[PDB]
Amino acid sequence: QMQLVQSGPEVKKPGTSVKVSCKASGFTFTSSAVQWVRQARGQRLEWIGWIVVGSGNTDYAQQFQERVTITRDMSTSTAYMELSSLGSEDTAVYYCAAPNCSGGSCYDGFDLWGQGTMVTVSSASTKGPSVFPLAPSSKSTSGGTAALGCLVKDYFPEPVTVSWNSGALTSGVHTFPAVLQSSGLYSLSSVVTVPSSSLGTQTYICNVNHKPSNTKVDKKV
Amino acid sequence: EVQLVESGGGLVQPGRSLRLSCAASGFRFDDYALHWVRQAPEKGLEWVSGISWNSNNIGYAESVKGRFTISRDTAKKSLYLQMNDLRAEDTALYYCVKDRHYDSSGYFVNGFDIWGQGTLVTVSAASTKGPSVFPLAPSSKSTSGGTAALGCLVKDYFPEPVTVSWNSGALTSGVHTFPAVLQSSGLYSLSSVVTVPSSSLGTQTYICNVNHKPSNTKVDKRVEPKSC
Amino acid sequence: FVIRGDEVRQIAPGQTGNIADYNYKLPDDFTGCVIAWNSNKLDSKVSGN
Amino acid sequence: VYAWNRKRISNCVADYSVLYNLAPFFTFKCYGVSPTKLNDLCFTNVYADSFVIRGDEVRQIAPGQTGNIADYNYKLPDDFTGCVIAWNSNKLDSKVSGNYNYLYRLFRKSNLKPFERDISTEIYQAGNKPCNGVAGFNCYFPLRSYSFRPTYGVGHQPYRVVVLSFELLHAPATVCGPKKSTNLVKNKCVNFNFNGLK
Amino acid sequence: YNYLYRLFRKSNLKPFERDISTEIYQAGNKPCNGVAGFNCYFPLRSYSFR
Amino acid sequence: DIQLTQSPSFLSASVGDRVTVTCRASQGISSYVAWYQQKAGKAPTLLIYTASTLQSGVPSRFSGSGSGTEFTLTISSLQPEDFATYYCQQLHSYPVTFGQGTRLDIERTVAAPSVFIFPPSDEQLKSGTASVVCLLNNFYPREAKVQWKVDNALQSGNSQESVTEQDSKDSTYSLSSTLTLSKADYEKHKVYACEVTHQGLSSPVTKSFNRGEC
Amino acid sequence: EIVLTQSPGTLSLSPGERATLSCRGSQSVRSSYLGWYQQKPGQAPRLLIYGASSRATGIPDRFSGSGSGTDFTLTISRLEPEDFAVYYCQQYGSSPWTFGQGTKVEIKGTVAAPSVFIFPPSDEQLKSGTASVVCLLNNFYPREAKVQWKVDNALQSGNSQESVTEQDSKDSTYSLSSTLTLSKADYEKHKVYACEVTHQGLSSPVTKSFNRGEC
Amino acid sequence: DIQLTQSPSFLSASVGDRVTVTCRASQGISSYVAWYQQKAGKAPTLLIYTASTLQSGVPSRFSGSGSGTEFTLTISSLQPEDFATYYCQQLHSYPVTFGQGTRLDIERTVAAPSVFIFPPSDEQLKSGTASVVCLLNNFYPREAKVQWKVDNALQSGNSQESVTEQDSKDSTYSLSSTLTLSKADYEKHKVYACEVTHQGLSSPVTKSFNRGEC
């Protein structure tokens, strides 16, 4: 099967270099090409350059130059991209794209796309999240509906998966994407809408899972 | 001429067996492999069985194992497909095919060169029922842009066919006869409709002729606009 | 007839072997030609012939 | 390698002995005929070729073996009566900045028939879409040169390869090797071979 | 590199006779003294089967 | 057994183009692949065997190849007799499976489908059963979706659809959807509607009638 | 630098309606070196149109591309609920290959007023030395609204972070949550915290305010 | 060098089934592969060489095939002596490197683990060190996860896990997780809990004790 396999997520300090790999299988690598595309959260799909696998000629855009390198290995059938002088703006998703080649003929467009490599550039260290519930009150209730939640604050990586009552409560649950604070740490809010009559008779528990820091937090609401 | 003839098919009740026959003509029969293929309506084709020249390699699909038995005889040049404990899945058009290298499979070169016309095998609890025809009367909801849509609904028949003609064959333009569909009750049903100008409503009489030969039922249903 | 590749020699005047001795034997005085060819694409089964 | 050279060595006496002094031992491997008895036997015509490649492609040269350089440039035929010379040429074919004078082909529509002369330089249309003679996606320039520098390893070092191809025809044999002679003795009973009379 | 063979020798061999000698063969008048590159060759060259 | 899958289920095409189908297997059946073609209401006929070799009397336009687990039948040029359904078969093991088939279709201008709804007649209502028919007429793209809405509620599981063959005059198909309900159930509701989703149609068209309205 | 700009920022419509997408190039390119990619949230982009006129494999006939030179168009004849996503246009021929702005094709409906809820910081949160007030906006059709944080009737800027979820597939509702992050001392140094919403559906700006001592 | 990998690390199987091993490499090693079987507490022995040829005195149930970078070791039927660890071996060149191996396992009904937690002994506390042991007993799925929570805070990097071999009577596995902390650190905290996640448990089972409670 024709597919592209990329490296796992990476976290690196600013000013250093990052290594990104893209392995190809299921098609003639020595008759294909590699295109590198970087996408940030809600930003532009941008060009990093392309290489002919067969010949090895390289080209680079003016915007991304003198710190980007492309290398290839025929034995491993893997594409390699090097980025040096990392900055805070370099935190984004790296995609590798190749035009599928059935036999000796190659499709005139890029169809095979990798899953992406998450590269995060920041100087802060991996820290566990501090979870604080949003206790409901008479000021968060309107029309017989009560809303309560839990706040996740201060986690350097942001895969904070939030399940409620061990997954028993899912309706009306709104987990918002993490926002990067000025301190360099991530924060997110997860809230639910429940009937006001359920306050006092039903227990609400928010289960927070931050695997990078190996932290397990469950707070009463 | 290399030709193949199938025979023995028909309508069978569950719990009753049958025996299909595959005639051979125009080619040497003692050295050529033979296979059976069945085709149920609108589900592609399906392999049934395959025999060898020396009657040493005999194989069936696992779906039909334990109930069927293939045999061949050189004296009469025929292939015999034997039925036992027929069920609903057995309703299909059965083709007898001739291979080209005296064995079923395993060879680098194999192929069903000639395909027979096939015989129709139907398995059901059939009881002959005449068709019931109801008029699809034209109204304000069937008229769009100066043309009127009208038809007849042939409903309830264990025998599948019902030749439908309009005005004894005088009306042929715009006639659309839908294929029969097997209802949950086990009886067939279909619709035949024809598009006519709206100005012809009330001046031209439209009669649909439905003929069901197995039940010997002939009904001519006149379609009239719904008088509110 | 059909034989394997190794005993193609056995079908010839003056040579001996299981096939030559028992299956097919040529006379000492022979006037004719022998034709043989590979039949792996034609007579070979995956399961076995 | 992509543009090889051919010379017709005819109407002379060969001196294959001089070839052995080249190389520390040799790279002389010789196909289809005994290497050490080429002197006495006589041949019709002797073709000679010459080109420069890297290390692994001298192995790629061998008859029957398939390789991108081999199949796209030279492609010795299956039935071959002749043999090749090779030796290290790092001393006189290496540039510190990198030599750009030697080029090889990478990809073509198909393989060349034995001893085909192709110096094609047109833009290659790998895809069905017409390239129209301009570089871009799925439209690559078909010639890429080497870069020989002293710092590379022996595998990537340049090697000079000379290929000889013997052939026989209805000609009366012209180009074959030398015949040596001894002293002359008189008044003694001696078997003799005077120019074919014995 | 376990199968060797001989290439240069001074004279032809007699029938059913074996040599194992490893001495530098002199094709030139100048002596080689076991170590030389011009007109002097090592008698044995090894096979290389692939 | 080895499972064979046809990547294109249906393929509309025109004269002079190229058509390629893909037969994909699960295990590796080497090159023991052939193809058949069935004419309309006629027994299938072999075209190519061993995925590369033409049998006899077959037009040179037909061609194909295959290696490993991928096999492709290719038609260089199209002719009026080419329009048919093609099947691929495996030959490695003793059990044999036929492919689900690839149906090639003719090319014709897309026309918007006319939608008509027919309330159940009094005669069939006297029989205790009620069937409402939504007529979907004169459409070229066979892909058409019909949704039944009873009192603005979607009905599923009680509807059957029948599609006619390609018309020989205008190359437009016809589709009939029938929703069958009992007399009591039919009388328990007032508004019956059929919703038609077609590529040509700008918006989903709904035809509705009131039981108490003539 | 051949930059691509797509004028339509938003293409709010209904499933089925006429959809037209625009891709503008600052400099002309070759006729058949453009691409059209559709991207769903959480899914990798997939090619729709190559050569600016040709359809990719498996692409329904509803998608069609047209144009030449500097102006190109992506046409979808009939919108389907799987087709509401972000569409990208990318060049293939120039020395740079860049992507377009991206057209967010979403569903359209009547404007609905948001439900505003405000959350005072909990006692457990206050025990850690931090306090965050959350203003929640529920079920509003226009995705973007304006939320202002007023503390003791004074506007606050630079301490509020807002997050927005995707468009709902049932009742066409956009949600929004604004969180004002402050220290415990800063939270206890002020009395009244209010969030002001100036959403289009709201005829007048609705402000939800609360006092610390009334909790 | 060429890096070689076995896809299945563990594979539970029963008598009479079919077992397949996936030994995949990077470069093309032609057919220079072989398989070894290591008996429990014994030196490994050959099963197959050059990927196709049985060596000597090997049961006919063992078989294999493969081309290029792909090879398959196959066991048609299982016998009680088959249970062992398998290693595949490449032989293209001199940096010879063994694969990580595949361990075959028996098949039986899954069981739930019994979780017990042992507070550090007073004699241990007198030595300045404290060890908390969480015991897992009778869990048939060898795969089990244990997490240490101290004062409702999850601990990482200070726990060691030890698992016994499969029992010869009831085929049970026993896992011991030991959390080692200093006496001062142990006295600085009150609640110590070990959380066990296992296939036989519908929800995680946590055993906790308080330092101040006997």
Residue numbers in the entry:
A (entry chain F): 1 to 221
B (entry chain G): 1 to 228
C (entry chain K): 397 to 445
D (entry chain A): 347 to 544
E (entry chain D): 446 to 495
F (entry chain H), H (entry chain J): 1 to 214
G (entry chain E): 1 to 215
Authors' text:
To provide additional therapies against Omicron, we isolated a mAb named P2G3 from a previously infected vaccinated donor and showed that it has picomolar-range neutralizing activity against Omicron BA.1, BA.1.1, BA.2 and all other variants tested. Despite the exceptional neutralization profile of P2G3 against currently circulating variants, development of resistance is inevitable when a virus is under selective pressure. We report here that P5C3, a previously described potent and broadly active neutralizing mAb that acts by blocking the spike-ACE2 interaction, not only targets a highly conserved region of the RBD but can also bind Omicron spike concomitantly with P2G3. Apart from the in vitro neutralization activity, P2G3 alone and/or in combination with P5C3 confers an excellent in vivo protection in the SARS-CoV-2 Omicron non-human primate (NHP) challenge model in both the prophylactic and therapeutic settings.
To decipher the molecular features underlying P2G3 and P5C3 potent neutralization of Omicron spike, we performed single-particle cryo-electron microscopy (cryo-EM) reconstruction of the Omicron spike trimeric ectodomain bound to both Fabs, at a 3.04 Å resolution. Importantly, the binding epitope is largely non-overlapping with residues mutated in Omicron, a feature unique among almost all potent anti-SARS-CoV-2 mAbs reported so far. The unique angle of attack of P2G3 on the RBD domain, predicted to allow binding in both up- and down-RBD positions of the spike trimer, may explain why this antibody remains potently active against the Omicron variant.
